[PDB]
């Protein structure tokens, strides 16, 4: 196509536009594709009833953070 032949690559594209495109592509392909498994540890920490000795009373069973 005439327009496809006329259109120029990144080295002719301006620097700031290239930076914006790189930022969007980096977010789409690297940041989003990163995975790390924290749900099990977070839920265990939330379900742990802590600070029993500093509580020292246990008059009523205080609801845990997950609760």
């Amino acid at each position: 196509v005439v327009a496809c032949f006329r259109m120029a690559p990144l080295y002719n594209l301006p620097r700031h536009r290239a930076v914006n495109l790189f930022l969007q592509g980096y977010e789409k392909s690297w940041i989003e594709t990163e995975e790390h498994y924290f749900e099990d540890k977070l839920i265990e920490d939330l379900a742990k009833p802590g600070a029993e000795p500093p509580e020292e009373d246990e008059g009523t069973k205080r609801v845990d953070p997950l609760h």
Partner: peptide
Amino acid sequence: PQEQINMLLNFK
């Protein structure tokens, strides 16, 4: 240009 960016960045 967006396709060029994604092709150049597709090496994770």
